[PDB]
Design an enzyme around this catalytic site. Structure first.
Site, PDB file in Angstrom:
ATOM      1  N   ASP A  48      36.861 -19.044 -10.171  1.00 20.41           N
ATOM      2  CA  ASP A  48      36.089 -17.826 -10.383  1.00 20.41           C
ATOM      3  C   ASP A  48      37.019 -16.635 -10.581  1.00 20.41           C
ATOM      4  O   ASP A  48      38.104 -16.571 -10.004  1.00 20.41           O
ATOM      5  CB  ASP A  48      35.169 -17.558  -9.192  1.00 20.41           C
ATOM      6  CG  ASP A  48      34.120 -16.500  -9.487  1.00 20.41           C
ATOM      7  OD1 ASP A  48      33.886 -16.189 -10.679  1.00 20.41           O
ATOM      8  OD2 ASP A  48      33.529 -15.973  -8.518  1.00 20.41           O
ATOM      9  N   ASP A  63      34.347 -17.865  -4.189  1.00 22.42           N
ATOM     10  CA  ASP A  63      34.104 -17.102  -2.973  1.00 22.42           C
ATOM     11  C   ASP A  63      32.699 -16.519  -2.883  1.00 22.42           C
ATOM     12  O   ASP A  63      32.420 -15.772  -1.939  1.00 22.42           O
ATOM     13  CB  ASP A  63      35.114 -15.960  -2.849  1.00 22.42           C
ATOM     14  CG  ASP A  63      34.779 -14.781  -3.750  1.00 22.42           C
ATOM     15  OD1 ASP A  63      34.338 -15.004  -4.899  1.00 22.42           O
ATOM     16  OD2 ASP A  63      34.956 -13.626  -3.307  1.00 22.42           O
ATOM     17  N   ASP A 107      29.111 -19.797  -6.899  1.00 25.07           N
ATOM     18  CA  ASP A 107      29.822 -21.062  -6.878  1.00 25.07           C
ATOM     19  C   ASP A 107      29.260 -22.036  -5.861  1.00 25.07           C
ATOM     20  O   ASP A 107      29.901 -23.052  -5.580  1.00 25.07           O
ATOM     21  CB  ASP A 107      31.309 -20.814  -6.634  1.00 25.07           C
ATOM     22  CG  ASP A 107      32.081 -20.680  -7.926  1.00 25.07           C
ATOM     23  OD1 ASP A 107      31.486 -20.958  -8.987  1.00 25.07           O
ATOM     24  OD2 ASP A 107      33.273 -20.308  -7.895  1.00 25.07           O
TER      25      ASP A 107
HETATM   26  F1  BEF Z   1      32.318 -13.936  -9.823  1.00 28.41           F
HETATM   27 BE1  BEF Z   1      32.525 -15.013  -8.705  1.00 28.41          BE
HETATM   28  F2  BEF Z   1      31.571 -16.174  -9.077  1.00 28.41           F
HETATM   29  F3  BEF Z   1      32.135 -14.460  -7.324  1.00 28.41           F
HETATM   30 MG   LIG Z   2      33.783 -14.012  -6.573  1.00 30.60          MG
END
Ligand code: BEF
Ligand SMILES: [Mg+2]
Ligand SMILES: CCCCC/C=C/C/C=C/C/C=C/C/C=C/CCCC(=O)O[C@@H](COC(=O)CCCCCCCCCCCCCCCCC)COP(=O)(O)O[C@@H]1[C@H](O)[C@H](O)[C@@H](OP(=O)(O)O)[C@H](OP(=O)(O)O)[C@H]1O
Length: 941
Positions: free
Chosen positions: A354, A675, A679
């Site tokens: 991410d 985080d 996800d």
């Molecule tokens: F943009 Be990440 F999925 F927190």
């Molecule tokens: Mg993130």
């Protein structure tokens, strides 16, 4: 008749597209309010507990965890494994069949099963309990006219809630009316910049997102599980190593069955031929009483050979090695939770990380500055410019920014400072702290009442300004805003330590714009700070802002960016040369994702790999009717590096497409880092899912296996190192154990068919298989890892555990051990001039001759492990043994225990005392193994 299915369908459609949809489905967000028994004023007018329970059919707004059990459920779950099933079946059939008119082997196997089950259960329970350690209300709602505080659990559909800055939204809602509202959706949505909420555009309030500035009121549409967080949370409810181990276990157990069948067939054939070659039995009626007993004894003899073949110490040794590795990994801030995900990261072939939170610090900070017409690519020392510009800038930044916006220390251990207010002018405020100054005294000296006039931010002009008249009879004004907005309204600039100079718009504004272009190319947003002093006489008219906003004097221009973590660029470079390709999947803008992808090195210049948006990603894969076929995903996933504007479903679709694809030559093992609640789904499908410890939401840590407590990206590499080291340790222990088993089974086969006595008693083999080899696994898994492991390419998902070099050592050392054992058995009596013990009446004192063979068999294994430390073709098997004290300690302890056992054994161990000359001869015969190791290494593999 609310049909909540259409209510949650109104959700999950963020953006301006929601405004279009509500225009045709409803009115202007007041029609939906009328479809419910609520009004904008005193919404849900009567509290009416009966009506509250009537509307409670939507949700209760509470989701509790499970906490399955203390110890029993984990123990019961651990027992359902293929290896343990065959081990226990063999144990029980051996124990039961020993009484047909055995006692030791069954008890040993059952004890080994109990030990491995208990170790696994205890380790899993401890890790699960430790995980919850790091993971460890009422707000204003207008019930009946007067707004009254109400607990979160009592929120129902239709309640009108008031939101002010600093609050946390408990449930999804629709913007009714309010001032300029900015919501931080970095965790839920994944957008780095602050999102402005208005009735006209984007009136979609989501649960679990902080509010930065502004005040307003909203309806509540989805209360509990139906909310955006609830959908993901309730969707959240065989490691690669276990599959290989099960395959090996069912291959080994199959091999011993053929040997048992061979023994029974050969012995029965020999009996039948020998009996029916000298005479002929009646064949008529003698077959009933006693003929079947011969064959049942032959079947028992075959089964007692079958029992030896299977390795009864493999599960316990593997569990001990994995537990030691997991305990050693916690010192690198990796908290493994399942004890079998320790190895899955070693052979990883792809990583999907991410952007916001993981690769970037998720905090707006000033990257580069431009002060005194001297470009500084890095944050300078405050003594560099060392002029009135420093104090003037500090005063401008402190006074001009809103006093509610302030930066606070973490007041914790190992945490980043928190940012509460608007974080677009909080990096600008932190720039002062980066210059090692103090902003608080300036603001404390001048509160709002001492600030004469304030020009708040307005839609017409994207600029904010304030004016203070304190310093003297003359006046002073400060201005802050976008780059081009204020630059065109600027007439003079400061030059170094000198006074102001004319900023005439001829080639000078052009040069300033020339230095602006690199800032915009690098993704940095440009914000400038200006000031202008007003004469006291005459008093200027503040109402006429036409000219007072012009003729400004800019002091500096600073770039603001969401920077990468300090260690990310190097960590990606190392893990990319180890055969692991890295991709970035995020929900942010395509422009912002691309800019940071280049800095991290994910995509290099040259436009080699394609970067695709989420809508195009969904549109392309579906084959018209609206279903996903693997061919379309195989078309685009091999060369897709950046994926922007992706809903949580898209991330799950991508990580599922890579895992379930045979387009490439080798199967892929995907690991996902994240985080945020985005996800959630993507961490579950991944084989091993990392998660940030201190900067991660609770949903991300529920779906993760290895939590990075120190949330630093450099610990991904060490996970790879430790996974590869664990694989090597398991390989070398298998190499040792297979030679032990092959030698033992061949000796037993010879001692059953050709002769009637086996030199290795049941009690003697128990100590070698259970106690000695268990400590031999810990001595082999304790070699410290080295950086050199990060050059080997990843192994396949289907590559067998036993390599080609391991088959050379397993069969190579079985030749040496067999010949010496056979010679000591057959002709050793004349070599040692000792009375033969080849045949016994089954009730006899322990012969010294067989103790020689037993001690030779044990003493050859002690020097086999010093040789088994090099799985590859390393000739020097003594390297680094000094950097391994526990290995030498275990070897010496085993040697001393062997001495004590053989000298003071007696009847139970079938051993007799030995004279020192025989001890020396046995030690030399053992030491010959080291010499034979070089010879067996010489042959090409
Ligand atoms: F943009 Be990440 F999925 F927190
Ligand atoms: Mg993130
Ligand atoms: C000592 O060698 O292990 C003994 C077992 O120990 C005993 O104890 C058995 C007791 C009797 C001993 C008699 C021998 C024989 O079983 P194995 O484990 O050797 O059999 C596998 C299997 O056959 C795979 O299928 C092969 O894989 P592939 O698909 O390529 O054929 C693989 O070969 P590779 O290493 O090249 O991958 C072999 O290892």
């Amino acid at each position: 008749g609310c049909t909540m299915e259409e209510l949650r369908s109104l959700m999950e459609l963020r953006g301006t597209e929601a405004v279009v949809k509500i225009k045709e489905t409803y009115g202007d967000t007041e029609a939906i309010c009328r479809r419910l028994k609520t009004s904008p004023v005193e919404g849900l007018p009567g509290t009416a507990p009966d009506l509250e329970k009537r509307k409670q059919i939507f949700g209760q707004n509470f989701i509790p965890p499970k906490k399955p059990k203390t110890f029993l459920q984990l123990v019961w779950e651990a027992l359902q494994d293929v290896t343990l099933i065959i081990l226990e079946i063999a144990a029980i059939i051996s124990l039961g069949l020993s009484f047909y008119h055995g006692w030791i082997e069954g008890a040993a196997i059952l004890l080994s099963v109990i030990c491995v089950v208990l170790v696994t259960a205890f380790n899993d329970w401890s890790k699960e309990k430790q995980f919850r350690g790091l993971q460890s209300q009422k707000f204003t709602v207008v019930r009946a006219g007067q707004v009254v505080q109400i607990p979160v659990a009592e929120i129902v559909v239709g309640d009108i809630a008031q939101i002010k800055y600093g609050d946390l939204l408990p449930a999804d809602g629709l913007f009714i009316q309010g001032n300029d509202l900015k919501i931080d959706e970095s965790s839920l949505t994944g957008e780095s910049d602050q999102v402005r909420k208005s009735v006209d555009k984007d009136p979609m309030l989501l649960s679990g997102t902080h509010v930065m500035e502004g005040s307003g009121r909203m309806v509540v549409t989805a209360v509990g599980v139906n909310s955006q967080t609830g959908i993901i949370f309730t969707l959240l409810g065989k490691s690669v190593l276990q599959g290989k181990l099960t395959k090996l276990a069912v291959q080994i157990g199959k091999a011993g069955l053929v040997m048992s069948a061979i023994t029974v067939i050969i012995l029965v054939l020999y009996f039948t031929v020998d009996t029916f070659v000298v005479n002929k039995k009646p064949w008529l009626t003698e077959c009933t009483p006693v003929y079947v007993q011969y064959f049942v004894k032959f079947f028992i003899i075959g089964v007692t050979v079958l029992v030896v073949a299977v390795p009864e110490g493999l599960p316990l040794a593997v569990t001990i090695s994995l537990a030691y590795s997991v305990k050693k990994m916690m010192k690198d801030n990796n908290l493994v939770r399942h004890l079998d995900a320790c190895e899955t990261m070693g052979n990883a072939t792809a990583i999907c990380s991410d952007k916001t939170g993981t690769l970037t610090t998720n905090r707006m900070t000033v990257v580069q500055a431009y002060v005194g017409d001297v470009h500084y690519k890095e944050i300078p020392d405050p003594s560099s410019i060392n002029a009135k510009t420093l104090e003037l800038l500090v005063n401008a930044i402190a006074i001009n920014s809103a006093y509610t916006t302030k930066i606070l220390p973490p007041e914790k251990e190992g945490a980043l400072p928190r940012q509460v207010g608007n974080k677009t002018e909080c990096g600008l405020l932190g720039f002062v702290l980066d210059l090692r100054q103090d902003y608080e005294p300036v603001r404390s000296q001048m509160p709002e009442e001492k600030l004469y006039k304030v020009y708040t931010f307005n839609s017409v002009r994207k600029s904010m300004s304030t004016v203070i008249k304190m310093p003297d009879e003359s006046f002073r004004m400060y201005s802050k805003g976008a780059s081009e907005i204020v630059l065109k309204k600027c007439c003079k600039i400061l030059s170094g330590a000198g006074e102001a100079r004319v900023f005439r718009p001829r080639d000078r504004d052009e040069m300033v714009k020339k230095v602006i272009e690199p800032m915009a190319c690098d993704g940095l947003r440009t914000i400038c700070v200006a000031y202008r002093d007003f004469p006291s006489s005459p008093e200027p008219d503040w109402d006429n802002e036409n000219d007072i906003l012009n003729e400004l004097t800019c002091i500096c221009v600073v770039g603001i960016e969401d920077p990468v973590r300090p260690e990310v660029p190097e960590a990606i470079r190392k893990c990319q040369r180890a055969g692991i390709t890295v991709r970035m999947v995020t929900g942010d803008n395509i422009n912002t994702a691309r800019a940071i992808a280049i800095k991290c090195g994910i995509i290099h210049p040259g436009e080699d790999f394609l970067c695709l948006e989420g809508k195009e990603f969904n549109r392309r894969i579906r084959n018209e009717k609206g279903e996903i076929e693997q061919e379309r995903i195989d078309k685009i996933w091999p060369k897709l590096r950046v994926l922007a504007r992706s809903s949580p479903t898209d991330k799950h679709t991508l990580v599922k497409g890579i895992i379930d694809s045979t387009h490439t030559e080798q199967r892929q093992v995907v690991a996902v880092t994240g985080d945020g609640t985005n996800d959630g789904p993507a961490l579950k499908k991944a084989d091993v899912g990392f998660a940030m410890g201190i900067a991660g939401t609770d949903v991300a840590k529920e779906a993760s296996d290895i939590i990075l407590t120190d949330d630093n990206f450099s610990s991904i590499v060490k996970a790879v190192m430790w996974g590869r080291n664990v694989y090597d340790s398991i390989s070398k222990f298998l190499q040792f154990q297979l030679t032990v088993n092959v030698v033992a089974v061949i000796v037993a086969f010879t001692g059953a068919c050709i002769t009637q006595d086996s030199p290795l008693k049941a009690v003697q083999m128990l100590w070698v298989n259970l106690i000695m080899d268990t400590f031999a696994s810990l001595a082999l898994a304790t070699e410290p890892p080295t950086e050199t492991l990060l050059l080997r390419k990843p192994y396949g998902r289907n590559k067998p555990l036993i390599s080609r070099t391991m088959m050379k050592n397993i069969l190579g050392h079985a030749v040496y051990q067999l010949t010496l054992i056979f010679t000591l058995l057959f002709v050793g009596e004349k070599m040692f001039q000792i009375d033969s013990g080849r045949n016994a009446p089954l009730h006899s004192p322990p012969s010294e001759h067989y103790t020689i063979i037993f001690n030779t068999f044990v003493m050859m294994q002690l020097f086999n492990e010093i040789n088994a430390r090099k799985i590859h073709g390393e000739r020097n098997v003594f390297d680094g043994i000094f950097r391994n004290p526990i290995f030498c300690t275990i070897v010496l302890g085993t040697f001393a225990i062997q001495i004590v056992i053989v000298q003071f054994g007696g009847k139970p161990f079938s051993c007799s005392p030995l004279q020192l000359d025989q001890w020396m001869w046995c030690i030399f015969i053992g030491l010959g193994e080291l010499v034979w190791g070089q010879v067996i290494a010489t042959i090409p593999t």
